[PDB]
């Protein structure tokens, strides 16, 4: 009823919607992985009469909810969708969204990297991402590869109109206490991936992780924090 969504106000098998700002919702969904439940979030961004999306919603099943909250919801179509980094959370439901008609998009690296472990495989390479520090515009989106972090091929995403800077798994929620997920990190480079996230985007009004609640540029340097302790 207006608070952020966590799974325990998901039902089963469902996708809920957010509203960040005009014309951006996230989207956030469940998912059971090595016996336990985590939530996960992507973006949505409205580009004219389409619809951007950024990550499925981690599953076959969660992507196709997705995109009937979205035709509940909003009721333009989705047309592209970029997937941030190789792992199930940010592609597990690309082959849904094919079968959709979405045209799907990722890194050459992210594309590599979910083939080697059979994952689901956008269709579309991103080139111009590929030196940290690289950014190229994508509809009503800025990409921007900030270096390795918690995987080689993370990507963030930037919505200008409305200065909402969606940092995927990258990033981590302020109430996090350690660094998440940290199979194919780079915890080493990890804060100066984010270093380079906070200098390309000073004004971010909004900041979305991969999973959990949003904030402010709070949750920049939080990242960077918890990334270190874990290190260490
Ligand atoms: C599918 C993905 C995955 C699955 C389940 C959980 C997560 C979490 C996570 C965990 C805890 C917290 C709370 S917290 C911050 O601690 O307070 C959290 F917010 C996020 C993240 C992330 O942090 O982004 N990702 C997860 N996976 C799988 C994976 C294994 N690898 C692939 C392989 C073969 N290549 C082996 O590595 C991954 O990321
Ligand atoms: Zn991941
Ligand atoms: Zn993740």
Not at 27 to 45: C, K, M
Not at 85 to 106: E, I, K, Q, S
Request: aromatic residues 6%.
């Amino acid at each position: 009823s207006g608070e952020y969504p966590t799974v325990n106000e998901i039902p089963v098998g469902e996708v809920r919607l957010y509203q960040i700002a005009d014309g951006v919702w996230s989207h956030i969904a469940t998912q059971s992985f090595d016996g336990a439940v985590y939530p996960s979030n992507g973006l949505i961004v409205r580009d004219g009469d389409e619809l951007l999306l950024i990550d499925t919603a981690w599953g076959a099943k969660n992507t196709a909810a997705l995109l009937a909250e979205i035709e509940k919801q909003i009721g333009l179509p989705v047309t592209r969708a970029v997937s941030t980094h190789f792992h199930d959370d940010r592609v597990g439901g690309v082959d849904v969204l094919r079968a959709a008609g979405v045209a799907t998009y990722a890194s050459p690296s992210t594309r590599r990297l979910a083939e080697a472990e059979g994952n689901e495989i956008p269709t579309h390479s991103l080139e111009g991402l590929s030196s940290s520090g690289d950014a190229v515009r994508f509809g009503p989106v800025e990409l921007f590869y900030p270096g390795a972090a918690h995987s080689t091929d993370n990507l963030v995403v930037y919505v200008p109109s409305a200065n909402v800077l969606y940092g995927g798994c990258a990033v981590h929620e302020l109430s996090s206490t350690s660094a998440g997920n940290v199979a194919d990190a780079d915890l080493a480079e990890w804060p100066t991936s984010v270093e380079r996230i906070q200098k390309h985007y000073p004004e971010a009004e909004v900041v979305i992780p991969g999973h959990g609640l949003p904030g402010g540029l709070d949750l920049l340097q939080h990242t960077a924090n918890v990334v270190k302790a874990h290190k260490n």
